[PDB]
XYZ file of C-alpha atoms in Angstrom:
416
model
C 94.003 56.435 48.650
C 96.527 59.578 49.033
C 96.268 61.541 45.994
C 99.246 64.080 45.458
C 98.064 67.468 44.897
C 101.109 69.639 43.783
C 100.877 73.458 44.441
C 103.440 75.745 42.631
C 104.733 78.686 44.432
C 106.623 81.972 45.198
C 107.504 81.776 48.420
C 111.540 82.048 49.384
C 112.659 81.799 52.619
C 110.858 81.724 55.996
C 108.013 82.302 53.880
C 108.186 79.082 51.726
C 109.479 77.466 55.099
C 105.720 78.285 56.752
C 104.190 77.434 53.696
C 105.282 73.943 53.688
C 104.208 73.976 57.292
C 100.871 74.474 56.484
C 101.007 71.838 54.329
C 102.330 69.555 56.612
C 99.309 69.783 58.865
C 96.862 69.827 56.519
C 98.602 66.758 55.403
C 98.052 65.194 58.792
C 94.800 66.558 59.448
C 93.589 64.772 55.855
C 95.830 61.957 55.328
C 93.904 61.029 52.016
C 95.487 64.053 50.106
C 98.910 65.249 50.017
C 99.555 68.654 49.442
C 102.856 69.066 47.885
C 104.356 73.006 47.724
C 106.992 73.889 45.235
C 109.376 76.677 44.788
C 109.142 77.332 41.207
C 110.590 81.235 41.537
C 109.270 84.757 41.716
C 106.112 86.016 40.645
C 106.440 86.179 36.878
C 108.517 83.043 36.701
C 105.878 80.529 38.492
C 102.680 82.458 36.159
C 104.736 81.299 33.118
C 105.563 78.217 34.371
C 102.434 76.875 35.413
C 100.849 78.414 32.323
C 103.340 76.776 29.964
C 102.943 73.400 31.976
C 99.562 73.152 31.349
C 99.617 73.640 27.567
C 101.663 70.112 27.796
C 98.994 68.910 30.640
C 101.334 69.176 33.687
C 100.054 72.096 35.226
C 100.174 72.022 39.262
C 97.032 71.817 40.737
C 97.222 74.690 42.606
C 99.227 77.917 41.237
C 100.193 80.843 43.649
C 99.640 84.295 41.338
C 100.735 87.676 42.261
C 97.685 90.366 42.312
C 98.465 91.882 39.058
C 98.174 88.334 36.920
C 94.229 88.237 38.411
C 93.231 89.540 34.503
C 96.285 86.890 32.932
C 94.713 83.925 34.841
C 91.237 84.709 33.541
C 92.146 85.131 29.953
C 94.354 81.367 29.969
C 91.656 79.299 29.822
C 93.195 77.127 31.781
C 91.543 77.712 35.563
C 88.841 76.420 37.402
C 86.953 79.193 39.437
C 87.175 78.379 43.471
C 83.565 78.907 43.552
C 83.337 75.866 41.298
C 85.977 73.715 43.058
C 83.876 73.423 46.017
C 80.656 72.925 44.559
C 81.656 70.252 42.454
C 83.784 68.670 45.399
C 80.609 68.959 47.521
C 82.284 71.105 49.900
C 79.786 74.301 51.530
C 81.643 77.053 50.711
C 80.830 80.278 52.624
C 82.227 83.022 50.737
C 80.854 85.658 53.680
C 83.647 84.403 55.559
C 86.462 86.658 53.811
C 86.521 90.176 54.501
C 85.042 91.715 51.604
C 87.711 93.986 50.602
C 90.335 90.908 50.148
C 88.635 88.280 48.292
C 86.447 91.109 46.172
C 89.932 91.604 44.364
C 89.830 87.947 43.308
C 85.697 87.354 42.730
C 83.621 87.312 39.671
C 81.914 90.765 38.776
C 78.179 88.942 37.469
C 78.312 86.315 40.177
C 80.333 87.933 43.220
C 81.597 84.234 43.759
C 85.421 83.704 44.155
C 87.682 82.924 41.474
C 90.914 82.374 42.801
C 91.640 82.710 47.054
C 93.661 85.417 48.535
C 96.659 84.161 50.398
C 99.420 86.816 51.045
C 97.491 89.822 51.110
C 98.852 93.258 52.279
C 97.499 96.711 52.154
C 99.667 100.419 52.540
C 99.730 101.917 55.830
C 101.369 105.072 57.029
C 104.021 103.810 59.480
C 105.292 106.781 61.791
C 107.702 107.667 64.473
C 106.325 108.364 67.675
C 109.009 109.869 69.488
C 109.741 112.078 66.327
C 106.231 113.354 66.361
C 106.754 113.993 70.849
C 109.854 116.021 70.005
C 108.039 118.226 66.973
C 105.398 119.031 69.573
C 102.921 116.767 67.511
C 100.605 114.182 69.717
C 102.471 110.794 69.099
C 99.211 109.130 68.987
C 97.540 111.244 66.212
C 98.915 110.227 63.280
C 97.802 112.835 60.263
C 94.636 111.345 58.755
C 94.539 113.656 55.893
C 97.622 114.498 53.517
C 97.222 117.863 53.988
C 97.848 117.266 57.866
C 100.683 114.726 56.477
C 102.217 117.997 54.418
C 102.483 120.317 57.655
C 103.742 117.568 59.923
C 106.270 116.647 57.678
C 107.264 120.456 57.782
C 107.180 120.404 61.659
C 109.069 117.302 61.387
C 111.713 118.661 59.602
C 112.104 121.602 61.336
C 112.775 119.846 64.409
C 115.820 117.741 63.212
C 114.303 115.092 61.281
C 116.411 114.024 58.041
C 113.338 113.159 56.154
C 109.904 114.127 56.838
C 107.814 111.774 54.856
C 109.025 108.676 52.820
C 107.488 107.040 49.660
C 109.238 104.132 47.980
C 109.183 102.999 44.182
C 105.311 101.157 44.226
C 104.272 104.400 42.883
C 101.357 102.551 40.423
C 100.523 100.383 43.920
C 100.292 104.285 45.883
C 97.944 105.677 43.253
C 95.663 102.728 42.998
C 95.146 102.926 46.686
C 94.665 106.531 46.518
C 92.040 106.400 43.991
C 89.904 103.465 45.857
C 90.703 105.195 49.690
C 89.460 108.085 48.194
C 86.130 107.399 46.363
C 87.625 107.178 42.830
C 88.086 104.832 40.240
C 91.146 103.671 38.237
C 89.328 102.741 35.646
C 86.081 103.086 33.768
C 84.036 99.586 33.495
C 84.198 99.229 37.489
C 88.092 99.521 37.882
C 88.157 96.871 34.983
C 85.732 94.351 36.698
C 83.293 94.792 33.827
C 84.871 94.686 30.466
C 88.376 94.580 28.847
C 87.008 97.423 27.228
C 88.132 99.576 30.032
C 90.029 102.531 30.028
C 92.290 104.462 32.800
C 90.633 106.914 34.695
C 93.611 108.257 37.180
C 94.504 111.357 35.816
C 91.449 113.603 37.214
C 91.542 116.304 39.496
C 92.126 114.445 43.237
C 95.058 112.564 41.724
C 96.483 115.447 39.934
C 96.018 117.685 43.094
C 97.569 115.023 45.381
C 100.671 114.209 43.422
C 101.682 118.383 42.679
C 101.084 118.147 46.725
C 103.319 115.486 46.837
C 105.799 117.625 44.482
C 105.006 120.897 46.624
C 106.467 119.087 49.665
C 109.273 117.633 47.242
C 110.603 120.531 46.458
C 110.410 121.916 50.090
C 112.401 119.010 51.480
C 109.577 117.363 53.284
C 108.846 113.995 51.228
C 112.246 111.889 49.918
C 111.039 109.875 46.414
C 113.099 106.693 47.107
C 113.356 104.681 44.454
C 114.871 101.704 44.870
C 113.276 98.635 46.609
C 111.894 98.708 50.364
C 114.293 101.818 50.698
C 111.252 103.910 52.392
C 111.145 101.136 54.790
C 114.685 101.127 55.841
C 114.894 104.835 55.875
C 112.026 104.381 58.161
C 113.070 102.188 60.434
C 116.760 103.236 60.584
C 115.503 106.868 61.972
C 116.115 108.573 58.875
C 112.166 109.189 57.803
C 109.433 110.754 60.299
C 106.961 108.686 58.741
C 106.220 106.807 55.387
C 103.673 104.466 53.746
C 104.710 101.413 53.057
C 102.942 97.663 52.856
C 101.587 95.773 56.142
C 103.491 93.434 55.717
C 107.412 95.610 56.711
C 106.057 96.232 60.306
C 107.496 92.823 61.194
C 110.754 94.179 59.070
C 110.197 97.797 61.076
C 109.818 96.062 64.792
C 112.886 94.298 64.300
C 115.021 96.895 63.101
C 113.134 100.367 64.374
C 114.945 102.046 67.473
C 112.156 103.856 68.160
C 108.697 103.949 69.475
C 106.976 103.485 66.401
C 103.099 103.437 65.388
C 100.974 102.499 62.525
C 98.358 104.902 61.347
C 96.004 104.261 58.045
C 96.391 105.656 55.066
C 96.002 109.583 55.124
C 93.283 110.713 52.908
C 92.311 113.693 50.625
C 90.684 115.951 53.390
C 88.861 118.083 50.126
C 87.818 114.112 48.879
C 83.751 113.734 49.702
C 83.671 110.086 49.433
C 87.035 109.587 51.687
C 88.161 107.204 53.259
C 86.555 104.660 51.444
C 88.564 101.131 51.309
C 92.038 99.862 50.560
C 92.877 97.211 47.784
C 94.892 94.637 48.511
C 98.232 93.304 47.135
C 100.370 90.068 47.486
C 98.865 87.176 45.661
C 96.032 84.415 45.663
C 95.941 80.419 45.053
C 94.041 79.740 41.582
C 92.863 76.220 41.040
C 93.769 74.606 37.314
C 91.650 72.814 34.846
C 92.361 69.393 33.677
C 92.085 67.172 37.053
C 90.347 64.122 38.784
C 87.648 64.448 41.117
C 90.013 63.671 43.955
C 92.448 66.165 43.228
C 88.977 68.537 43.143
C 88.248 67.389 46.572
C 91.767 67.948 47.983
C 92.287 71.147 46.362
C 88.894 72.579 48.782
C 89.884 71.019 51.706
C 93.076 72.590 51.974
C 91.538 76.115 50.543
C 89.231 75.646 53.494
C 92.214 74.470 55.812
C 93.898 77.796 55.247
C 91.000 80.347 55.949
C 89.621 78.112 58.925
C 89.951 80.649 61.733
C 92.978 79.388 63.144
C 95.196 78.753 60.227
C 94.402 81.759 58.646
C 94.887 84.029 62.662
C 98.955 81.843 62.948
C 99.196 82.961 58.627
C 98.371 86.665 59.659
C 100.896 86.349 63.029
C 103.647 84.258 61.369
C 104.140 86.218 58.250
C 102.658 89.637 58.424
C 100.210 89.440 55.447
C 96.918 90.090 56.391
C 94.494 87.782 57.967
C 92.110 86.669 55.228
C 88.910 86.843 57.106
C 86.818 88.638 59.727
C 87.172 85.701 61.808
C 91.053 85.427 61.765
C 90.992 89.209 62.683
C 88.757 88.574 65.714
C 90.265 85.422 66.929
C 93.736 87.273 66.989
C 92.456 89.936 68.681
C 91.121 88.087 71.479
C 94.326 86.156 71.660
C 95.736 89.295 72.892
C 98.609 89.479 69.415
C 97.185 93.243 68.920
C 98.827 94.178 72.616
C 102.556 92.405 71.792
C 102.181 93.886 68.398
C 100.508 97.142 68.470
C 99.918 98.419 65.219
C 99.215 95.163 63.811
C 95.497 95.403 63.152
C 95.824 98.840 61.396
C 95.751 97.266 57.804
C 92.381 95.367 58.829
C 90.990 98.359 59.862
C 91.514 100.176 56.543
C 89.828 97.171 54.557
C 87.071 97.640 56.620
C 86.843 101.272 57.006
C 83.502 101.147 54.774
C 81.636 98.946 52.742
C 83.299 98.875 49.344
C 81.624 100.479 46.320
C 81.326 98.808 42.684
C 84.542 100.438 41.676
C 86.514 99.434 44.623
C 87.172 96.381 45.066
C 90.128 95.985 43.351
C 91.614 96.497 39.922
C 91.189 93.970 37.657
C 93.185 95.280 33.996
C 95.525 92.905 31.539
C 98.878 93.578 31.332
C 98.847 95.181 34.543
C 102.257 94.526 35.372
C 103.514 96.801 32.491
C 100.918 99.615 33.102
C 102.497 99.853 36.967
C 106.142 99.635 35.381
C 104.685 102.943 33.406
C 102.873 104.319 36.340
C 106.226 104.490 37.916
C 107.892 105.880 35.831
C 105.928 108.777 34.860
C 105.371 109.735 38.614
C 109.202 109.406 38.684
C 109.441 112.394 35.830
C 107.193 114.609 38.431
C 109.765 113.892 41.261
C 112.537 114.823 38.899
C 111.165 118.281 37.419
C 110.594 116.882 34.179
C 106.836 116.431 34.167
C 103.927 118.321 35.569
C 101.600 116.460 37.988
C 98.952 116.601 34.796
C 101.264 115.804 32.130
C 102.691 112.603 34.251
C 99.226 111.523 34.719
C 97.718 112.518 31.436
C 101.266 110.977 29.855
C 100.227 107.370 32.001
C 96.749 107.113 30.916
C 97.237 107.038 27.513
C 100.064 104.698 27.683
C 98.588 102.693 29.966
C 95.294 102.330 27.380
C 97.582 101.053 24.973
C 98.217 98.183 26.715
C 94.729 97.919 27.564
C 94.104 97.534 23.779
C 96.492 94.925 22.977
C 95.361 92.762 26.193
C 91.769 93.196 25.006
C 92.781 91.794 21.371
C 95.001 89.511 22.419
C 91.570 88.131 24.367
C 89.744 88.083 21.110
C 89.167 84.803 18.461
């Protein structure tokens, strides 16, 4: 038999076009299932699509969900865990295979086994330009590691013709979750959510306070540009406007195409008064959850292509193809030794940060409902410190309890 397996997802463009691709071979390389991808729009439009689909019981089988919908997927009822796909389609299932710091996003906090699979995953990285730094006197292959070394360099930067010292765009929310996990801190009580909806936000203590008035400090000096409006820190980056900025893995295919410069890719600067730092990135992007309500076959289709895409090839031409981060440790190592890291330099930086150190109960992602609308909050609050409105504290303290009340009404909204 051939047994269709449809697979709802987000992915426009060259993305969808590699997507289907993938598909393609797996459909070759296991000609009794049929994997078939469909556009069904962005982010929020495919979650309520394939939620409302399966109310009627014509869900997809397979549903691609954005980071932030992790908690939303969980709470439908209407998902089968990944962990569970493969043991009931008999399939062995090594769950060692992922680096820890991209499928720990997506796992379950009792078991540790994985509920839905990361697919696109990116990470921030400090992207910055090399021949900016040579000219400012700074070593062009020293990036600052700290954000106090980002603060004077950005000064030095400036000072030595530079537009824009250093760059950060709108993902404000995405910046501070990073920060906190990079630096040793949670997000949020209960593990950064993993244990309980009965969380709480946790972001407005002293190394997020103190690195946001920095952040304001160099504001009002000139030497960091608040840009607001999508992937404009990227294109002020790569159009030689902006020394350096943090933006996600996944531009540096964007920034080698457009950059006319000698750029480099640094990780993350850290709090250099943080003990605990550098700790780990979190990811973003999205993973592939599995839904409730089919046949065996479908079961046994739906593994072998999960498998397909993190087999050590597939996921090494995902990771070189699209930018997003290879999925596992193997993937990473294979394009390594394929020599990508040499046309590409820069391109294993975002690995590196996931595996700067093991991750600790509270890192390994953020796991909250109504997460989208907390970040749209996030945002917007760091946007009143930018603006003079706000202090760093108020912003933060402001968030928080916002933030909590949407907490509350996800946790209710959970409850019979």
């Amino acid at each position: 038999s051939v047994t269709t397996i449809p697979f709802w997802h987000s992915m426009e463009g060259e993305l969808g076009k590699e997507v289907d691709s993938l598909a393609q071979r797996f459909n070759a390389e296991n000609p009794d299932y049929k994997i078939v991808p469909t556009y069904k729009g962005n982010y929020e439009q495919n979650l309520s699509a394939g939620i409302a689909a399966f109310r009627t019981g014509n869900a997809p089988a397979i549903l691609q969900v954005y980071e932030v919908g992790t908690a939303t997927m969980m709470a439908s009822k209407a998902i089968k865990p990944v962990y569970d796909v493969f043991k009931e389609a008999g399939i062995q299932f090594d769950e060692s295979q992922f680096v820890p710091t991209v499928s720990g996003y997506y796992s379950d906090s009792k078991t540790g086994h994985l509920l839905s699979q990361p697919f696109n995953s990116s990470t921030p990285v400090l992207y910055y330009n090399k021949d900016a730094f040579k000219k400012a006197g700074l070593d062009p292959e020293q990036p600052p590691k700290t954000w106090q070394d980002l603060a004077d360099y950005a000064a030095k930067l400036k000072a030595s013709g530079m537009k824009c010292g250093y760059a950060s765009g709108s993902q404000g929310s995405i910046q501070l979750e990073n920060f906190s996990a990079w630096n040793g801190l949670p997000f949020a009580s209960k593990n950064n959510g993993f244990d309980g909806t009965d969380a709480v936000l946790e972001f407005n203590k002293p190394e997020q306070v103190k690195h946001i008035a920095m952040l304001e400090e160099m504001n009002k000096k000139g030497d960091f540009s608040y840009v607001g409006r999508k992937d404009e820190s990227t294109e002020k980056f790569y159009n030689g406007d902006c020394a350096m900025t943090t933006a996600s893995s996944g531009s540096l295919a964007n920034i080698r195409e457009y950059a006319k410069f000698n750029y480099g890719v640094g990780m993350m600067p850290y709090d250099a008064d943080a003990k605990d730092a550098p700790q780990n990135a979190i990811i973003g992007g999205a993973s592939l959850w599995v839904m409730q309500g089919k046949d065996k076959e479908t079961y046994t289709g739906v593994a072998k292509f999960l498998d397909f895409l993190a087999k050590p090839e597939n996921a090494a031409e995902w990771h070189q193809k699209t930018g997003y981060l290879p999925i596992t440790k193997a993937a990473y190592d294979l394009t390594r030794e394929q020599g990508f890291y040499e046309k590409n330099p820069g391109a294993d930086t975002a690995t590196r940060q996931m595996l700067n150190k093991p991750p600790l109960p509270f890192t390994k992602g953020l796991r909250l409902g109504n997460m989208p609308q907390i970040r749209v909050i996030v945002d917007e609050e760091l946007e009143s410190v930018w603006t003079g409105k706000k202090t760093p504290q108020q912003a933060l303290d402001t968030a928080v309890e916002r933030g909590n009340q949407l907490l509350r009404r996800f946790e209710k909204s959970t409850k019979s």
